[PDB]
Amino acid sequence: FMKMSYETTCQFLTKAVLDNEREQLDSPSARIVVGKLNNVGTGSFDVLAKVPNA
DNA sequence: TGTCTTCAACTGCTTTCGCATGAAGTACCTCCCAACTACTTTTCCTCACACTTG
């Protein structure tokens, strides 16, 4: 997706499809394309909660 | 038989963000339309000739 979103979009698309490529959705641009929390900065980690069991 | 070299044709881009305010193509064709004039249209009106008379 980072290739697609710079230049020769269709050329990078063609080389991607011909590869049967899978996007691991790491590129910040690519991640934006899919509406995903950006992996940089505050999205570099996850937050969980400690909850009482009793 | 096998590998190598230059040139020219082809690909893709080369500031960002907004106002304005959108308009305008047009050949080939025309049927519709507006026109001037004349012609035509529907109801109505009023008189008239012949045979016969005496």
Nucleotide whose C1' lies closest to the alpha carbon of residue A9: B12
What would you measure as the largest C-alpha separation in chain A, in angstroms?
Answer: 59
CA distance A34 to A31: 5
Tokens representing A21 are 């490529």
3-state secondary structure at position A33: helix
Q: Is any atom of nucleic acid chain B found less than 7 Å from the CB of residue A10?
A: yes
CA A16 to chain centre: 15
In 3D space, the residue among A25, A36, A20 whose CA is nearest the CA of residue A2 turns out to be A25
Q: How far apart are CA A25 and CA A53, in angstroms?
A: 36
